[PDB]
Amino acid sequence: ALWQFNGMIKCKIPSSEPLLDFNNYGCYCGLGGSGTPVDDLDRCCQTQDNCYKQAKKLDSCKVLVDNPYTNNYSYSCSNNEITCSSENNACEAFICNCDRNAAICFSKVPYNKEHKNLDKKNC
Ligand SMILES: [Ca+2]
């Protein structure tokens, strides 16, 4: 979950401190999400939100109250690449992949310092 996701982002964007730079970005980067994403970074977050939401409709994820933000999985970072571990059971493997996709997206889009701390009246 989170602790793991923060590391995935640091794996790809080494200079970052994720919970500081990507927290409260746009309408999607943070808890919840509503409106239209303000940019590509925000669209990344929207997508991940939809993935988590999707992890929910899976029989494999039904029995894990811990929640994906805190549903712990195994992965690795070796020379800036993320690898989800085969040892992850069905649900965690799916959440892992959602987080890998997002950390990769984040590293491929521009950061607009105009959208952090964005007021939720724009969503
Ligand atoms: Ca979100």
Curated annotation (Swiss-Prot):
Disulfide bonds join C11-C77, C27-C123, C29-C45, C44-C105, C51-C98, C61-C91, C84-C96. Activated by trypsin cleavage in the duodenum. Can also be activated by thrombin or autocatalytically. It is an enzyme of class 3 (hydrolase). Binds 1 Ca(2+) ion per subunit. One of its GO terms (biological process) is innate immune response in mucosa. The active site is at Q48, D99. Transmembrane segments: none annotated. Coiled coil: none annotated. It is found in: Secreted. Ca(2+) binds at Y28, G30, G32, D49. It catalyses: a 1,2-diacyl-sn-glycero-3-phosphocholine + H2O = a 1-acyl-sn-glycero-3-phosphocholine + a fatty acid + H(+); 1,2-ditetradecanoyl-sn-glycero-3-phosphocholine + H2O = 1-tetradecanoyl-sn-glycero-3-phosphocholine + tetradecanoate + H(+); 1,2-dihexadecanoyl-sn-glycero-3-phosphocholine + H2O = 1-hexadecanoyl-sn-glycero-3-phosphocholine + hexadecanoate + H(+); 1-hexadecanoyl-2-(9Z-octadecenoyl)-sn-glycero-3-phosphocholine + H2O = 1-hexadecanoyl-sn-glycero-3-phosphocholine + (9Z)-octadecenoate + H(+). The keyword Secreted applies. Secretory calcium-dependent phospholipase A2 that primarily targets dietary phospholipids in the intestinal tract. Hydrolyzes the ester bond of the fatty acyl group attached at sn-2 position of phospholipids (phospholipase A2 activity) with preference for phosphatidylethanolamines and phosphatidylglycerols over phosphatidylcholines. May play a role in the biosynthesis of N-acyl ethanolamines that regulate energy metabolism and inflammation in the intestinal tract. Monomer or homodimer. Belongs to the phospholipase A2 family. This is Phospholipase A2. It comes from Bos taurus. The chain holds residues 23 to 145 of 145 of the full protein.
